[PDB]
């Protein structure tokens, strides 16, 4: 149970309209975030809505990947969360499915917070789901 899907969402910046957060989160291979280019970190995150115990999150990645992120969490309440706390990272991303588990842990938003792109162009992802 993809806990994420029609979650409302945030980004850092979009690449135009039809690539904004929730693309990444409507449970559709073919719609994707996007954000904008360029060598800035960038970063969608997830409200879930409530707190939920997640312990695993699934990327899929679009050509524009990074290879440098973190899956991130906050436990801040409200709609605007500003305390993140690092649950993975990588340096070594390689693009289209990302399986990646960690410890569960309580968490009311999950962020992805990409920093080294693969490409020259910006970080953008079909699918950004969240599980148990
Ligand atoms: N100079 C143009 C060249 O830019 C163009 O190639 C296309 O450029 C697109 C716009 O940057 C690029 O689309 C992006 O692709 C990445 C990676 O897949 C995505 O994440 C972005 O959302 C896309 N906007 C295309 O990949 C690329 N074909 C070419 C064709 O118009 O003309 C060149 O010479």
Same mark, same amino acid.
């Given at each position: 149970?993809?806990?994420?899907? %029609? @979650? /409302?969402?945030?980004?850092? #910046? ?9 693309? /990444? ?5 073919? =719609? ?7 060598? *800035? ?11 939920? #115990?997640?312990? &695993? $999150? @699934? ?7 990074? =290879?440098?992120? *973190?899956?991130? $969490?906050? %436990?801040? #309440?409200?709609?605007?969360?500003? %305390? ?16 990646? !588990? ?5 968490? @009311?938003? $999950? &962020? $992805?917070?990409?920093? !080294?792109?693969? !490409?020259?162009?910006?970080? #953008? ?8």
């Amino acid at each position: 149970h993809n806990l994420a899907l %029609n @979650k /409302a969402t945030a980004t850092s #910046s979009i690449e135009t309209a039809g690539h904004e957060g929730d693309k /990444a989160v409507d449970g559709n291979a073919a =719609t994707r975030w996007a954000s904008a280019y360029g060598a *800035s970190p960038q970063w969608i995150y997830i409200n879930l809505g409530s707190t939920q #115990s997640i312990s &695993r $999150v @699934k990327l899929n990645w679009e050509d524009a990947y990074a =290879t440098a992120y *973190s899956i991130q $969490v906050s %436990n801040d #309440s409200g709609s605007t969360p500003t %305390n993140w706390t690092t649950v993975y990272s990588t340096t070594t991303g390689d693009g289209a499915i990302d399986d990646i !588990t960690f410890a569960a842990t309580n968490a @009311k938003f $999950v &962020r $992805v917070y990409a920093t !080294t792109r693969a !490409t020259a162009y910006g970080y #953008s992802l079909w699918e950004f789901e969240v599980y148990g």
